Design goal:
Chains A, C: Belongs to the adenosylhomocysteinase family. 4 copies of one chain form a homotetramer. Chain A is α/β, with parallel strands linked by helices. In chain A, 39% of the residues lie in helices and 13% in strands. The longest helix of chain A has 24 residues. The radius of gyration of chain A is 25 Å and the shape is globular. The two termini of chain A are 47 Å apart. The complex binds nicotinamide-adenine-dinucleotide (NAD) (4 copies), adenosine and potassium ion (3 copies).
Chain lengths: 458, 459, 458, 461
């Protein structure tokens, strides 16, 4: 009962799992610590995390505690066929597949909900994009009563869930595991300072030392990425709208500049400050806004400059005017060449042009695999610990006199994160000093924890 | 004028330092200019207890220029600078502080701060850093407490005392957590220690740091600042922590996590200490703020001629009381001591079995140096001033009994004021911020002018 | 005739040659300067450096002045198929492809000398490593009558030239281009620094922030490698045999240790500091010596360790040990898994293996592309200058009386290198101040002549 | 005899002596020579003249010289570079010295003359140890009669080396001299890392200014220039480099710096129109590391941004135009070694001026003026090399040789590399590092004896 295209590729995926499993000591520590206790015995879960080589390890930890899972996908493209087949090669049925059919990933989801005609006894839901949440709440209202908790990991998907609580029909407590410190720090400031320079140097094979680059935004992603260039000898300037992030940039050794004169964006050609644009060799966008690099900027920029993007959306740079006015030429599968001569008819070589690296999209995926396995360790143990927490309280088994008391969406409490951090530190080989009772009394916390309040920003 | 300073001749030098320092702190000068006509502190009375360096003088002077009259003393024994005290006292302003005092003189400073001519001062707010002055007010003189509108706290260890008194209801007047603003926690705790730590070490020991090995205890904000101050000079740094989150961050920043005790278990016996690791470290810095984090049995197993100093706010992190009973002390120079091991009655003048200790385990950046640059103190003194502005308008003591029941709590400053302070800080460096267009602001769900981040944002 | 992997990549190649032409201002300036006179009319060159994009640009510059060239691969895993095909499309026979074999590596050199069944009338020589020079000097010395000079790129070559000069078996003058400042303090120091971590990531996909490494040797290449591994958050230590280099490393912020107790190496298993090797994760050797990593340290290394090497010859690591007692498994090109159990057989579930990069040869070229264009520009400008200088003398057409006075190893003067440095500076947009007559008189040099004396170490 | 000294005072000896006894553990190489050569005393009968800044480390060097059987007299190389405590400590030990702080050039010349003149009569010296060639040039100028008995001279700085080279080129030098600046453990150790260690400390303790987010301009990219540029960056500073040498500019560009010129296109003519006034209007800190003349002209201090900091790290003061300052603008002091320069005029002074200028150490050495110089572990190698050079040259006996052989012994030479390796090896062991030793196979393959030296004479490191 599998839809995976090719099942014979399991051994390749098996050894890829084996090499990938070693670099994720968190899940190994969770498997060792809770072995023999079996805290997930009798649990039935259905979920749709994006299928990759690490996702196959994530399922392996869950089944090690005695759970039964049926699997699907949250998108169309993020699914490695050989790894999914390797999971299918075991006793776990899987349905994720790279069929490239947008009208067919919905029908794949329908098979996990119902085994054969009759619906399945679902206790926990491990959602990624929130579409499973909506399909359960809309098409099968009767199954929701036997659900203990759901788990969501995405951006602005929790935003939809929070508002749906106010509008009613949400009868199950939910966890906002996205706000974990470990996962937040691993996702933004660490996975970037390792992959930005690698993707750039793979795409262009240029030399960075001595050149000048401009960075838009100094948020989490912008700070994590701004230090991948200054450590290479580049001279870096920062652009921002939030004064506090600008102050942090000033105190960190950078310089803050504005593309428009006086920072005012009037829209006329007189607003563009061409003086500073005649010395720039590279522009990066780290913000999540829209049209932060407009059409007027790209005319006044210095020749042969490079262009790239890190934000999730693609409308940071005015690609519509660029496609409407200037012609494109391809250098290699993911590098493009755009001239400013005219609509068509460029020479073999020219002196007036620019360069794009990901046709205005996410550079981390176009040029490279993405984050490594070590960094993505934290984001996958939070899910498991949260399932542990929600499986024991048994919301669905409680009578109606306390449904209103326990019906809310919350975040993961501080204690469970520290366990993951301790396991990760033990992965590196570090050692932690246990507190004597006198010192714990002096600082007024328990020996086991927690060590910090909820108003603390690490 | 209450003349009590070590020397008075040093006023002019402090005056020139004050003139130069004003050009350094632009946000505070701009606040003074903008709030010059409103006089939002008309009739405000303050008590002051903070480090008496040259930066605090401009804050005191703007407080005076905004219609407030105040009294001051030093938070710590080794904090005052004589030129600043002389220059400020030359302006007809009472103050009581100098450098190198004793514990009895230290407490006499507070008892002079809160008393005048045998009668209690008619103070309406209190400014405290350290929490000792609050304890003196609360314990011995409860009769003046109800006349208080609020108190400002400058450091974390004071906030701990405020919270523990709030838990048992001993706190009777509300307080503002000044130490919580983003322009405070991510500026003073981190960047200033980074600028100041190596300066004090060099001014005290003159030792070369490149190629040596050091151990830093704790990885909070002060720990991060210290690690940055040390590694940038070319050292080999190791960090010890009790919070797993901070250990993970230390592993992420490129440092190593080690524990002096075997298996991280403090057994207390002389055997549990991992003497192999301590037989290589040349410098120890304590950042935790806990008590007795530097055990007596670890000090006996260190390398000869090792350096010991403290950056925390208390002197209980190092077992300096154990040394004073068993080992002999000789003074190299002011604030520098050689402690010879294995003996008390005397020391061989050429003996090599000794240690060097700086500032007797107290604050190291203040006792041995000047502390922080004014460019850093500006971002804190602005929040202090604004918090006092907000606090004075409440007039807590004049509310009816019912209102006081729902007004006794702790809280923070709004984000808009902090963003204004940051904006005025940035422009001093010569930078330019870009303003949004209405379409972008409506896209990100934010106004053109106002807060840009939600409350749960960790920055 | 020729043999390359494929030729259809000539369009993409030519696009990359055009884009790389813009990042080498010095070579463009010299090609513009000498195109109108062609000093190399009739000059014939037989070169054997690495065949890459820069090398193709160098060949184009050589043929732009009227020369005739032939080429072959310098290392077994260094050539680029696209660049070789693009140059072969220009009318120059070339023999180089990836995945070559040691016996087949000799095949390339044998036919670059022979033309249509006869040896060719080569006049000048370019080599990188001295492997072709020994073949020339060892089998048939009848070529050296008409050869005007020999040029060497690397330090090992110069060592071999001097070792031959000790015996007096050398018969042709050589001009040293290695010891030029614009080459020694640029190529070794900055190319390896800019490329080593990228080559590591292109093949490991690990997280380098929070690991342990050891780098052996602290030369210019060693300094570059140590600075390269610093910026990735790694923890590194330096082992040296030279007191001065050890002092410099100690002053740079490293820990200096040796894998031997008190430094004494005798061969017994009891002479190895087993504790230190039990926690190291990555090892890189940058020495140029023999038996730098003996057999006994490979037995006492920590599980799951990565082995790296950027030496020209494969004598740093005792590979015969593995080939005679251990078994290898390949996960992907230029990466193998070497188990420490036996050569008979193994299982995938074991954890007693080692990870090796590029089978122990140069990983800068084996696992990556190599140096960028802007770094090779400075080397190729000096190469072209020395190439033009030596031909004008016409050594091979002189009587023995003047032949006696010319057998010598010479270098380029100081003044010529300063022009190349000036051209490289203006590529970044910088401006160099001009000395006034008074200042020039006071210092003791002419207003525009060489400024530093011959003994300056820089 | 010993009584005739002149220092700040006496009482600082007890504390100074503690500083020396602390420093003895910080300099292993010098103590290694002290232990090795004290049993045979190869310096007996030497009468050494000396001129280098008086500090703690130089006091330990003087103690090392006496421990081998020397009779030395010492003085000041720089006007502001003395230390009171070490000067008091050495004086009470029986070795006469003449050095204090905040003197005038008359007193400086008086001390220089008095060091070489004993009881009104020229002193029958056999050795000279100068720094900068001042004392060496005096003898060729006023006392030509001392040079028939003087065995040799030693030189420490680059400017002194250049002066001796010019003297030899003109054919007026009389006595052979050895330059110790060219040794690897001197050129690539003292000039670079010590300037790195001591640059920002002087700024930090002279002005107490934050260095994050500021802009500075470093002129010159020698060894000292490289060290200073590396010292400024590590504090979080955006700094710029200018030069006249293309190769060093290429190195600076590769390092991660921007190369600009303080003139419109690099051509200077003395006209104000040639100044790149836009760039100089936003620069806060200036450092000159050239040793040339007039690298900071009047039109740079007439066009700089207000409230900027000015410094010099080269040997001599003429590198910047102080003479313009002394007669066009007014001066006022805030603290010792710090000043205020006002561009409004030489009168009309008022404390609330907003376009003032700040100058550090009056254009002399700032690492030794506003700070206490390099640490002991760096000066260890330089002093060990100096004492080794003195020991080696004392064994040749140039004065007593016949004039026929004297013609072939007049040159400027450098020490053999084996002594450099000995110094470096004993320096390393003060850190804890362990140096590997070669097996016969590796020694034969490399082609170098197991005992050193392992590198040719053309290596640059
Ligand atoms: N792995 C990845 O590539 C990855 C991961 C998570 C998020 N992201 C994306 O990165 C973007 C931001 O990430 P973040 O966590 O740093 O966000 P953030 O919440 O920290 O905000 C980004 C910053 O951009 C600033 N900004 C907004 N408009 C601007 C403008 N007009 N000019 C200059 N600065 C402006 C904001 O003030 C903020 O400081 C989003 O699009 C997010 O989806 C990427
Ligand atoms: N000198 C200064 O400039 C300065 C400035 C601000 C605060 N302080 C003082 O420093 C102290 C601590 O600084 P903070 O409050 O900013 O830091 P912090 O609140 O972030 O916590 C200090 C760190 O020490 C750790 N720690 C506690 N006990 C430990 C133990 N036994 N072993 C190892 N680690 C342990 C904690 O987990 C925490 O990470 C306070 O008393 C504060 O008042 C000094
Ligand atoms: N990978 C590349 O891109 C590249 C480029 C050029 C040269 N190389 C090769 O690298 C090698 C060395 O490079 P280099 O020119 O910088 O060398 P180098 O001449 O500058 O010296 C190498 C260093 O290794 C040290 N060393 C020698 N034997 C040692 C031992 N047994 N233990 C420890 N240290 C030892 C030496 O003292 C020296 O400091 C040569 O074989 C050269 O051909 C590699
Ligand atoms: N303060 C200290 O502790 C200390 C220590 C050692 C040396 N020094 C002094 O430093 C000085 C020089 O040091 P060094 O030996 O590294 O010098 P250096 O000779 O090695 O380099 C001087 C640099 O100045 C540049 N230069 C010269 N004139 C210039 C001009 N007009 N404009 C721009 N650049 C110009 C040259 O191109 C060169 O790069 C000497 O006078 C020496 O006495 C001071
Ligand atoms: N020189 C100084 N002037 C004023 N406040 C200081 C100084 N040094 C430290 N502080 C502050 O005093 C507190 C010490 O714990 C912190 O808030 C720290 O930022
Ligand atoms: K200060
Ligand atoms: K290439
Ligand atoms: K010193």
């Amino acid at each position: 009962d599998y839809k995976v295209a090719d099942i014979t590729l399991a051994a390749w995926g098996r050894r890829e799992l084996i090499i990938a499993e070693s670099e994720m000591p968190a899940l190994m520590g969770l498997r060792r610590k809770y072995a023999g206790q079996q805290p997930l015995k009798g649990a039935k879960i259905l979920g749709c995390i994006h299928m990759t080589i690490q996702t196959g390890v994530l399922i392996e930890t869950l089944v090690a505690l005695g759970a039964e899972v049926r699997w699907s996908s949250c998108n169309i493209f993020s699914t490695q066929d050989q790894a999914a087949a390797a999971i299918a090669a075991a006793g776990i049925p899987v349905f994720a597949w790279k069929g490239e059919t947008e009208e067919e990933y919905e029908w794949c989801i329908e098979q996990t909900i119902l085994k054969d005609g009759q619906p399945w006894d679902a206790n926990m839901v491990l959602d990624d994009g929130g579409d499973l949440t909506e399909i359960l709440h809309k098409k099968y209202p009767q199954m929701l009563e036997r659900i203990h908790g759901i788990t969501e990991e995405t951006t602005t998907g929790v935003h939809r869930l929070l508002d749906m609580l106010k509008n009613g029909t949400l009868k199950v407590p939910a966890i906002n595991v996205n706000d974990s410190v470990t996962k937040s720090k691993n996702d933004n400031k660490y996975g970037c300072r390792h992959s930005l320079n690698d993707a750039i140097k793979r795409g262009t094979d240029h030399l960075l030392s001595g050149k000048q680059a401009l960075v838009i935004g100094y948020g989490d992603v912008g700070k994590g990425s701004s230090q991948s260039l200054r450590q290479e000898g580049m001279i870096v300037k920062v652009a921002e709208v939030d004064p506090i992030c600008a102050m942090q940039a000033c105190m960190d050794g950078f310089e803050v500049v504005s593309p428009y004169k006086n920072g005012i964006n009037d829209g006329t050609e007189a607003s563009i400050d061409a003086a500073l644009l005649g010395k720039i060799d590279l522009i990066v966008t780290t913000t999540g806004n829209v049209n932060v690099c407009d059409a007027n900027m790209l005319k006044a920029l210095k020749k042969r400059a490079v262009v790239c993007n890190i934000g999730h959306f693609d409308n940071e740079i005015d690609t519509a005017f660029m496609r409407k006015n200037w012609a494109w030429e391809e250098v290699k599968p993911q590098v493009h060449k755009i001239h400013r001569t005219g609509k068509d008819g460029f020479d073999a070589h020219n002196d007036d042009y620019l360069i794009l690296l990901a046709e205005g999209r996410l550079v981390n995926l176009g040029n490279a695999t993405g984050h490594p396995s070590r960094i993505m360790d934290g984001s996958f143990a939070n899910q498991v610990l949260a399932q542990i927490h929600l499986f024991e309280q048994k919301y669905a088994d409680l009578p109606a006199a306390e449904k209103a008391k326990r019906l809310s969406v919350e975040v993961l409490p501080k204690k469970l994160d520290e366990e993951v951090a301790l396991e990760m530190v033990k992965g590196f080989g570090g050692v932690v000093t246990q507190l004597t009772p006198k010192q714990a009394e002096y600082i007024g916390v328990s020996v086991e924890g927690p060590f910090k309040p909820d108003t603390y920003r690490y």
